[PDB]
Design a binder for this molecule. Structure first.
Ligand code: HEA
Ligand code: HEA
Ligand SMILES: CCCCCCCCCCO[C@@H]1O[C@H](CO)[C@@H](O[C@H]2O[C@H](CO)[C@@H](O)[C@H](O)[C@H]2O)[C@H](O)[C@H]1O
Ligand SMILES: CCCCCCCCCCO[C@@H]1O[C@H](CO)[C@@H](O[C@H]2O[C@H](CO)[C@@H](O)[C@H](O)[C@H]2O)[C@H](O)[C@H]1O
Ligand SMILES: CCCCCCCCCCO[C@@H]1O[C@H](CO)[C@@H](O[C@H]2O[C@H](CO)[C@@H](O)[C@H](O)[C@H]2O)[C@H](O)[C@H]1O
Ligand SMILES: CCCCCCCCCCO[C@@H]1O[C@H](CO)[C@@H](O[C@H]2O[C@H](CO)[C@@H](O)[C@H](O)[C@H]2O)[C@H](O)[C@H]1O
Ligand SMILES: CCCCCCCCCCO[C@@H]1O[C@H](CO)[C@@H](O[C@H]2O[C@H](CO)[C@@H](O)[C@H](O)[C@H]2O)[C@H](O)[C@H]1O
Ligand SMILES: OC[C@H]1O[C@H](O[C@H]2[C@H](O)[C@@H](O)[C@@H](O)O[C@@H]2CO)[C@H](O)[C@@H](O)[C@@H]1O
Ligand SMILES: CCCCCCCCCCCCC
Ligand SMILES: CCCCCCCCCCCCC
Ligand SMILES: CCCCCCCCCCCCC
Ligand SMILES: CCCCCCCCCCCCC
Ligand SMILES: CCCCCCCCCCCCC
Ligand SMILES: CCCCCCCCCCCCC
Ligand SMILES: CCCCCCCCCCCCC
Ligand SMILES: CCCCCCCCCCCCC
Ligand SMILES: CCCCCCCCCCCCC
Ligand SMILES: CCCCCCCCCCCCC
Ligand SMILES: CCCCCCCCCCCCC
Ligand SMILES: CCCC[C@@H](O)[C@@H](O)CO
Ligand SMILES: CCCC[C@@H](O)[C@@H](O)CO
Ligand SMILES: [Ca+2]
Ligand SMILES: [Cu+2]
Ligand SMILES: [Cu+2]
Ligand SMILES: [Cu+2]
Ligand SMILES: [Mg+2]
Lengths: 256, 534
């Protein structure tokens, strides 16, 4: 499996998209980024031009105007218009994001201090996922010769330290996955940047999110609500595989 | 001697707030230097659990020298305690005390022609509650806290159940500190509002009140509604922790998300309480150094009122991933976007003030022009964040951190510096050296942008908030950001030298108005410093 959902050295953009929802986020953000960059460059150029054009040595007698009705109407209406344009494109994305489709695969995720529990209710599969290098694998949340060898043995490299877990959430590609998220003790937050999903794991509440992965590979997330001492050390690994490889994984868990 | 600390005069109290806010600011900025030392490189090298087994002064100095990773057991609790202390000090004990308690107490009475505030003894009490709260916040750092260590590692907004289950009593001390800060703010606000309404000079109509005094007036009203709601939220934390209530504990039928609604009902107004006095200062400074009256005075006042009102109906944009309904997410998103409209009116009116002026690029004007550009950078990323569908990716990442440092550290703080350089001659009788003011400006401008602009990249790459350590791919921009923070810290130490130099041997001020006639408010008709009876 190719490692796809991960930060890259010196990166300035989003993590790669692997879902239709992530693609929409990339488009919506890029659209807004052009707007706010235009606005910001415009504001900045106006200030710099004004400083150059009206520096005291170049314009020795200041004007005294304090109004300009056409300009003030324009600079109230155009922002409103720009915001309505953004909202017009952004509310549809929001609805697509938050309306839960019918599940092909259902996983129930529980955040604990400091690890994640996974349950596939249709499959009677449950397991816990710890960071490779956590105390659960014999570490203490730092790189070491043993941790790098564990990363290598699990199919990763030292560069995936703090991202890779001992077990992965495995799902089939091109299927609708509905994830139910709750917290066992304090609030955690379950997320995968490549899928464009994030949902707080709140004790006492079961929240839902959905994704459909559009390509196979490995995708990482990290706990995204400060939960205590090992908040930085309870990540998320999702492996998106063929329908057949998914079934093979299910069968490996079937007790005879 | 200590008869400075006993004075009830609004000028004396303002100066206490300014110096104290600056000292607490140095504390909190020093925390961020240590934070950025640990974030400069992946792997944990400074915050080692091994430093705990030494004393409290041995452990301190060991903590400032890097260890090899094999000798450094990561101590995440120290990270969480530092960023919690950093945020609490900034949001309750630095910028609002400087802007509102400091410049507000000093200059709002002067600007409206009031000899003193309505309740001078209450004003002096407000300052002592501020010092008491600061003292409790600092004490919490050394009190038994989470994980059998010292300090509360719970984030500045104290989310339960994490905050209510944190062991020790550090967190209870932090809650009392915030209580004391809320009381100081409410007393201040009561004084501001009464003085503004009842003690204006006869013949100063309310539509001749300078914009800075308007900004202090609006801010005082926001405080009166927001801070009691915070007092409720944190008292519920205190009783869940100590008196058997279960407001936020699901085992007893409570709901942790309920705390978030109440906290953020205060928490968004808090940031408009921060920035409105900075808006007021920027109006006075730009009018003075463009040598031109402020463009659109009445829209400037109404925009601040609109921002302050809108600031109370947007709070759940801090909760898009906390389980909000799609209807709530859609409302709060659209309500939040509206705030861009009155804010834009102020940005454009400040540019229109400069347009056609005769612009003097002295230090206060540099801070104000930097404010216009950098607050706009921070404001537009706030609008990105209001889009819940994009906030799904950015929430609890360094993109949010970049947003709020641009509006606070490159925005409200630029207003504070604009005010200090604008007014230090008026307050002290001594003038700052102009070349040093400008060097301070450029060092801060370069350093602060290097610190926080790359944090957008880290957030876009998915780096979470509140992490002691990070995956190797985040190293490049974390290294750049830490370098920026070190340069900014040098800028701040330089600034403190500039203030020390100014107050001890700065050029003597001879004029009542050492700027020009377009500094046209009442403090510029008084001596420098003003007479004892203000
Ligand atoms: C000075 C303090 C301050 C100020 C003024 C602001 C101002 C704004 N903020 Fe910010 N914010 C914070 C401090 C501040 N914020 C802090 C501390 C947090 C994090 C809390 C925590 O979790 O710890 C935060 C987090 C925060 C969030 C939650 C994000 C998350 O956690 O996921 C959101 C969501 O919408 C938000 C949006 C906004 C918006 C829309 C404004 C608007 O007021 C900005 C309006 C200004 C402009 C837009 C620029 C000028 C306008 C123009 C040039 C006109 C044309 C522009 C357009 C048409 C767009 N900010
Ligand atoms: C006013 C508010 C304010 C200011 C000024 C700052 C200033 C700085 N902050 Fe920030 N910060 C917060 C408010 C602020 N911060 C909040 C609310 C959080 C969230 C905490 C949490 O997650 O719970 C936070 C968290 C935060 C993080 C993320 C922590 C994490 O997620 O783990 C980082 C990362 O580097 C950071 C770094 C810095 C640096 C390097 C500076 C500075 O060093 C940059 C340079 C600035 C200066 C050199 C001078 C500043 C001037 C003053 C403060 C005025 C002093 C007063 C007078 C002079 C009268 N801080
Ligand atoms: C402005 C006032 C205050 C400014 C303070 C500036 C402090 C700078 C600290 C120096 O850098 C640290 O110490 C070592 C010398 O650079 C390095 O050791 C490190 O060496 C490797 C660097 O890649 C790491 O992998 C190792 O874990 C680690 O021990 C490490 O890079 C870095 O953390
Ligand atoms: C985006 C921010 C850019 C700011 C743009 C500044 C507005 O430009 C000026 O506004 C004045 C309008 O108030 C005009 O003066 C006009 O109106 C004044 C009266 O208000 C008269 O005194 C002048 O003679 C007359 O030229 C002037 O022409 C125009 O260039
Ligand atoms: C990081 C920190 C932020 C920087 C804060 C900006 C510095 C504030 C200005 C200093 O305060 C003023 O200093 C004057 C000293 O000359 C005093 O004048 C006074 O001096 C005499 C006593 O020294 C008094 O009797 C007189 O009333 C009066 O003229 C005045 O009271 C005092 O308020
Ligand atoms: C904690 C980290 C702090 C790092 C800060 C680094 C400090 C760098 C100091 C540079 O040296 C200064 O350069 C100025 C160049 O302008 C000189 O002012 C000179 O130039 C001014 C501008 O013309 C004139 O007003 C003055 O008469 C004249 O002293 C000034 O004397 C000189 O000492
Ligand atoms: C980490 C700690 C950092 C320390 C920060 C210290 C910052 C304050 C330094 C101010 O420096 C002074 O500025 C004056 C300029 O305002 C200079 O006067 C010079 O310029 C004047 C103005 O032209 C002349 O009249 C003077 O004789 C001439 O000495 C003076 O030399 C210089 O020392
Ligand atoms: O993505 C398309 C989106 O369209 C509809 O959602 C509308 C909704 O019906 C209106 O009330 C409007 O105010 O909000 C949404 C804006 O598109 C569908 O109902 C929705 O399921 C679908 O995803
Ligand atoms: C990959 C970016 C290199 C560092 C640029 C510094 C500005
Ligand atoms: C594909 C690379 C994306 C780089 C975009 C830089 C994002 C910076 C966001 C800050 C916007 C401030 C105006
Ligand atoms: C992940 C592939 C999608 C890339 C999205 C790029 C869209 C840029 C939007 C620009 C819109 C300008 C008006
Ligand atoms: C002297 C006040 C500034 C504090 C510097 C911050 C560094 C704190 C190191 C923490 C060590 C834990 C014992
Ligand atoms: C190779 C031995 C270590 C060299 C790096 C030491 C840097 C220490 C910086 C400490 C700064 C404290 C403010
Ligand atoms: C005795 C329990 C603490 C009471 C504090 C107020 C609780 C009521 C909720 C009010 C919400 C903020 C106004
Ligand atoms: C004093 C203001 C408190 C903040 C409002 C609390 C609103 C609770 C809404 C719960 C929504 C459940 C669907
Ligand atoms: C964003 C603020 C930038 C303001 C430009 C100032 C140009 C300074 C030119 C030098 C003037 C004499 C030192
Ligand atoms: C009063 C005239 C002084 C000239 C400007 C001094 C500041 C120079 C800019 C230095 C930029 C370094 C970061
Ligand atoms: C607009 C403020 C910029 C602050 C400097 C940050 C460096 C950005 C470099 C981006 C490209 C590096 C490859
Ligand atoms: C690869 C080792 C990097 C260590 C560099 C330390 C840089 C410290 C710079 C301090 C600058 C203060 C202005
Ligand atoms: C001015 C606020 C714009 C509101 C906008 O977000 C939506 O109403 C557009 O459908
Ligand atoms: C793919 C094999 C299906 C095995 C099935 O019995 C289990 O998932 C249910 O326990
Ligand atoms: Ca480190
Ligand atoms: Cu967690
Ligand atoms: Cu966490
Ligand atoms: Cu807000
Ligand atoms: Mg969160």
């Amino acid at each position: 499996l190719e490692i796809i959902g991960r930060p890259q050295p010196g990166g300035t953009g989003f993590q790669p998209s692997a879902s239709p929802v992530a693609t929409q986020i990339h488009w919506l953000d890029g659209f807004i980024l052009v707007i706010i960059a235009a606005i910001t460059i415009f504001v900045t150029l106006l200030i710099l031009y004004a400083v150059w054009r009206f520096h005291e040595k170049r314009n020795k007698v200041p004007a005294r105007f304090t109004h300009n009705s056409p300009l003030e109407i324009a600079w109230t209406i155009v922002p409103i218009v720009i915001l309505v344009a953004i909202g017009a494109f952004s509310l549809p994305v929001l609805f697509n994001q938050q309306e839960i489709p019918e599940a092909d695969v259902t996983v129930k995720v529980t955040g604990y201090q400091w690890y994640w529990g996974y349950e596939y209710p249709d499959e009677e599969i449950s397991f816990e996922s710890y960071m490779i290098g956590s105390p659960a694998t014999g570490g203490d949340n730092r790189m070491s010769p043993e941790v790098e060898q564990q990363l290598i043995e699990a199919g990763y490299s030292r560069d995936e330290f703090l991202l890779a877990t001992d077990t992965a959430m495995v799902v089939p590609v091109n299927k609708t996955v509905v994830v139910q998220v709750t917290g066992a003790d304090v609030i955690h937050s379950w997320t995968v940047p490549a899928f464009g999903v994030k949902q707080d794991a709140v004790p006492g509440r079961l929240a839902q999110l959905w994704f459909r992965a559009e390509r196979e590979g490995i995708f990482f997330g990290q706990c995204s609500e400060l939960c205590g001492i090992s908040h930085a050390y309870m990540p998320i690994t999702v492996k998106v595989v063929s329908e057949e490889a998914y079934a093979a994984w299910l069968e490996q868990h079937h007790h005879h | 001697f200590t008869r400075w600390f006993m004075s009830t005069n609004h000028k004396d109290i303002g100066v206490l707030y300014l110096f104290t806010g600056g000292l607490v600011g140095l504390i909190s900025v020093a925390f961020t230097v240590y934070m950025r030392m640990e974030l400069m490189a992946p792997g944990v090298q400074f915050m080692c659990a091994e430093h705990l087994e030494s004393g409290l002064v041995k452990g301190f100095f060991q903590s400032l020298w890097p260890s090899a990773v094999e000798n450094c057991t990561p101590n995440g609790h120290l990270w969480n305690v530092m960023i919690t202390g950093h945020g609490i000090l900034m949001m309750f004990f630095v910028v609002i005390p400087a802007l509102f308690g400091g410049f507000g107490n000093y200059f709002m009475p002067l600007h409206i022609g009031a000899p003193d505030m309505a309740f001078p003894r209450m004003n002096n009490l407000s300052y002592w509650l501020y010092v008491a709260g600061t003292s409790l916040a600092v004490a919490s750092l050394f009190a038994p806290g989470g994980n059998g260590q010292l300090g509360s590692g719970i984030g500045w907004v104290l989310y339960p159940p994490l905050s209510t289950s944190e062991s020790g009593y550090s967190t209870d001390l932090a809650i009392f500190a915030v209580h004391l800060s809320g009381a100081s703010s409410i007393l201040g606000a009561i004084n501001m509002i009464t003085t503004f309404l009842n003690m204006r000079a006869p013949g100063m109509t309310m539509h001749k009140v300078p914009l800075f005094a308007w900004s202090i007036f609006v801010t005082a009203w926001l405080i009166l509604l927001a801070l009691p709601v915070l007092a409720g939220a944190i008292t519920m934390l205190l009783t869940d922790r100590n008196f058997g209530t279960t407001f936020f504990q699901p085992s007893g039928g409570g709901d942790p998300v309920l705390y978030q609604h109440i906290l953020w009902f205060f928490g968004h107004p808090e940031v408009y309480i921060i920035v409105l006095p900075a808006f007021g200062i920027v109006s006075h400074v730009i009018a003075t150094f463009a040598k031109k009256p402020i463009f659109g005075y009445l829209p400037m006042v109404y925009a601040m009122v609109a921002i302050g009102v809108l600031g109370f109906v947007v709070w759940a944009h801090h909760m898009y991933t906390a389980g909000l309904s799609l209807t709530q997410q859609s409302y709060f998103m659209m309500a939040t976007m509206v705030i861009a409209v009155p804010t834009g009116i102020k940005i454009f009116s400040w540019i229109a003030t400069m347009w056609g002026g005769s612009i003097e690029l002295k230090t206060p004007m540099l801070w104000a022009l930097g404010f216009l550009f950098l607050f706009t950078v921070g404001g537009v990323t706030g609008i990105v964040l209001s889009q819940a569908s994009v906030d799904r990716y950015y929430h609890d990442t360094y993109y949010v951190v970049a947003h709020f440092h641009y509006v606070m550290s490159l925005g409200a703080v630029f207003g504070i510096f604009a005010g200090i350089y604008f007014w230090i001659g008026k307050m002290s009788g001594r003038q700052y050296p102009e070349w040093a003011g400008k060097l301070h400006f450029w060092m801060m401008f370069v350093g602060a942008n290097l610190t926080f602009f790359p944090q957008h990249f880290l957030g876009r790459q998915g780096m979470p908030r509140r992490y002691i350590d990070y995956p190797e791919a985040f190293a490049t921009w974390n290294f750049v950001s830490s370098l920026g923070a070190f340069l900014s810290f040098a800028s701040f130490l330089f600034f403190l030298g500039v203030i020390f130099y100014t107050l001890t041997r700065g050029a003597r001020v001879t004029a009542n108005n050492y700027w020009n006639e377009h500094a046209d408010t009442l403090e510029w008709t008084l001596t420098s410093p003003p007479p004892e009876h203000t």
